[PDB]
Amino acid sequence: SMEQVAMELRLTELTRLLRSVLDQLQDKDPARIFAQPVSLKEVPDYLDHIKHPMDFATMRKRLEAQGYKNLHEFEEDFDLIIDNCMKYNARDTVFYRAAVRLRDQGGVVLRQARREVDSIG
């Protein structure tokens, strides 16, 4: 149908905007602490602690499959990256501190993204 196509164009444009958001958020992680999944070879107990692991490469795979229907789903995944880290790692670690800084810096990006998504529809 013409409607399904129009819907698919909207999704594609959402995907375009979320790709730009993702790049901006990932720049706020210059140490690449959140770039890849936590290694189950190196942290064999991880899934005993964290039930829904997340990282930027995994979000990128979802994004490129057009797997985010709206900004809320994308933000859920970004919040998992932060929240998982702040549970698994103690306050006095480079990891926890990296997550706090990512959260604080990403807030600004995500604020305008929401306005853009609402604005452009």
Curated annotation (Swiss-Prot):
Domain of life: Eukaryota
Cross-link Glycyl lysine isopeptide (Lys-Gly) (interchain with G-Cter in SUMO2), where in sequence: 41
Distribution of this protein across tissues and organs: Highly expressed in testis.
Domain Bromo: 9-113
Transmembrane region(s): none
Subcellular localization, as worded in the UniProt entry: Nucleus; Chromosome
Quaternary structure annotation from Swiss-Prot or TrEMBL: Component of some HBO1 complex composed of KAT7/HBO1, MEAF6, ING4 and BRD1/BRPF2. Component of the MOZ/MORF complex composed at least of ING5, KAT6A, KAT6B, MEAF6 and one of BRPF1, BRD1/BRPF2 and BRPF3. Interacts (via PHD-type zinc finger domain) with unmodified histone H3. Interacts (via PWWP domain) with dimethylated and trimethylated 'Lys-79' on histone H3.
Function: Scaffold subunit of various histone acetyltransferase (HAT) complexes, such as the MOZ/MORF and HBO1 complexes, that acts as a regulator of hematopoiesis. Plays a key role in HBO1 complex by directing KAT7/HBO1 specificity towards histone H3 'Lys-14' acetylation (H3K14ac), thereby promoting erythroid differentiation.
Protein name stated in the entry: Bromodomain-containing protein 1
Organism: Homo sapiens
Gene: BRD1
